[PDB]
């Protein structure tokens, strides 16, 4: 399997994509456990930028409520979990 | 807006995903001072699992062929770097 340049680039400059976002662990909020599942999966700015002090970052954003299930062993619910999800992404100076 | 559970869980469940892999200067003998891109998109596995302890590993993987633009001022040429690409994965007990 050879993947050709054109595709290697396009796909790993700069731009949203699906990013696993531990639950309990990410954000400092709520260290505890019973979620089902413990992570989730969003958008955001990843890749590379054409310089080696250019940074990738958000130039759309946006909050997703993410239904996680909650549990305290007799009683599962179905919570809210939000979090911000980029749409658009820029290479700029990390200043 | 909202994701579903049946939606955030599938996701978020251990497998195979795109996932941005740095070009660090592991590339030995890699003369270039300058990839392009300086990264590269793999499929590894990621996710998490239903419960600590277990994690989630490849059950099926192979090397993956990146085509890599390589830089010395004179002029660039491309090159090839390898890695490991995960095609399955699964739920294993702590190591």
Chains 1, 2 share one sequence.
Do not use: F, N
């Not at 709520?30 to 599942?37: F, G, N, S």
């Not at 239904?67 to 979090?83: C, F, K």
């Amino acid at each position: 399997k050879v993947v050709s340049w054109i595709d290697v680039y396009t796909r790993a400059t700069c731009q949203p994509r699906e990013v696993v976002v531990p639950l309990t662990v990410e954000l400092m909020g709520t260290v505890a456990k019973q979620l089902v599942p413990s992570c989730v999966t969003v958008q955001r700015c990843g890749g590379c930028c054409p310089d080696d002090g250019l940074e990738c970052v958000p130039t759309g954003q946006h909050q997703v409520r993410m239904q996680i299930l909650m549990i305290r062993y007799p009683s599962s619910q179905l919570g809210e979990m939000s979090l911000e999800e980029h749409s658009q992404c820029e290479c700029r100076p990390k200043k």
